[PDB]
A paper describes a structure:
AMA1, a type I transmembrane protein, is conserved across all Apicomplexans and its knockdown has been shown to markedly reduce invasion. Recently, Toxoplasma sporozoites were subjected to detailed transcriptomic and proteomic analyses. It was found that, in addition to the well-characterized “generic” AMA1 and RON2, sporozoites also express two paralogues dubbed sporoAMA1 and sporoRON2, respectively, that are not expressed at detectable levels in tachyzoites or bradyzoites. To better understand the mutually exclusive nature of the interaction between the sporozoite and generic AMA1/RON2 pairings, we set out to solve the crystal structure of apo sporoAMA1 and of sporoAMA1 bound to a portion of sporoRON2-D3 (sD3). The results presented here demonstrate that invasion of Toxoplasma sporozoites depends on the interaction of two previously uncharacterized proteins, sporoRON2 and sporoAMA1.
Overall, the structure of apo sporoAMA1 conforms to the expected three-domain architecture observed for other AMA1 structures, but reveals several divergent substructures including a network of apical surface loops that provide an unexpected degree of integration with the apical groove. In particular, apical loops 1 and 2 of domain I and the extended loop of domain II (DII loop) cover the region occupied by RON2 in previously determined AMA1/RON2 co-structures from both T. gondii and P. falciparum. In addition, sporoAMA1 loop 2 is slightly longer than the analogous loop in generic AMA1 and has an N-linked glycosylation at Asn230 that is positioned atop the groove. Loop 2 folds in over the top of the groove, and positions Pro227 directly over the tip of the DII loop, which appears to compensate for the lack of the central anchoring tyrosine observed in generic AMA1 (sporoAMA1 Ser252; generic AMA1 Tyr230), with Pro227 effectively pinning DII loop Phe376 and Trp377 into the base of the apical groove. Based on the degree to which the apical groove of sporoAMA1 is guarded, numerous specific interactions between sporoAMA1 and sporoRON2, particularly in the predicted initial binding site at the cysteine loop, are likely to be required to overcome the energy barriers of DI apical loop rearrangement and displacement of the DII loop.
Numbering used by the authors: 96 to 477
Amino acid sequence: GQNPWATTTAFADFMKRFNIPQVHGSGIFVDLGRDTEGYREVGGKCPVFGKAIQMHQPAEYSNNFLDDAPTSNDASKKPLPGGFNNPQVYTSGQKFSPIDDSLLQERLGTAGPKTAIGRCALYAYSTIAVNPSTNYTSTYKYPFVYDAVSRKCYVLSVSAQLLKGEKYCSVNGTPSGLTWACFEPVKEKSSARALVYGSAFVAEGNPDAWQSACPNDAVKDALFGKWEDGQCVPFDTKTSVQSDQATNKEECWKRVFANPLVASDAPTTYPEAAQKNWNDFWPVHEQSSPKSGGFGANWANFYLEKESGETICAIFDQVPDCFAPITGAVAYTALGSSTEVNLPQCDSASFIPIEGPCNNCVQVVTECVGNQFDQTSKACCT
Ligand SMILES: *[C@@H]1O[C@H](CO)[C@@H](O)[C@H](O)[C@H]1NC(C)=O
């Protein structure tokens, strides 16, 4: 009884998507998987759906990270107003960023990318960066944020994703006098905007590949598992890094992204250091800069524990290689959206059913019923 998820091009293409260290290959919470010219550079190959940078400027401020980043200091404003958005104008006087997707389609041409995410990544990948200190052109690549509501593409000249600690930044104006307010990445689900954060390297090769290669969506009525003993066995309390209750599935979706063990390239140590300058837009690359490579607790199973009446978010850190179809369960990642897709259909006419071994008169049977994957227990003592 072989893993049917390797048994078919369509099943194998679907499972491959969830091999995150392979297909993404960089941090997810904070992505700093590359370095160039001495700076940490955003590097993952997969778009990160719903990723926003939460800021903490005092109440009167805009506190919107898609705001123009500052072009000059004002020593008299602490913290300095601004977001992460690249604020350069073209010599025509048109802004670099944000740009309407409409226009990008025009500017990329007849053979440009067929997805808004591919366009926005390519647009970033093509943008000639400029050192925010020396003021000289650089080979550094900016990350991007596509907003699927405004249909606008943003290129961020600020590539920093996580700034923390009262030595280095203010929360809501405390301590006072700090140049930078604090900030950290968060999954958001808002009706007003629908964000996708990515490195420019989404564009590299085929900018549209993410659609097919990456774990863009939650999987409905299925759990991530591991094939063993002729059966998909889902990850649960036994085999997870945490498995606390969640009030609802969206909370689980947010949790996996924010969880302390998610693949992340943030420095785990705190070098006694002076305050960042107003224009330290890019993290400096140090010999000890961590690279998760996208290994970590990046997957979450959301299910109703039959035993206890509670919904569980079971976050785990193994690459899964099958799905257990279970009605009402959801499989999430730190990369994907909370929007839900089905398991690939299944061909009932040819699909060969696979039987687990009999243990205590119950075996697990995987079949195709009405063209859908089915996993059930079956009595096997007469
Ligand atoms: C960078 O160029 C700007 C002009 O846009 C200038 O105001 C600033 O002093 C320069 N920064 C340097 C070279 O320190």
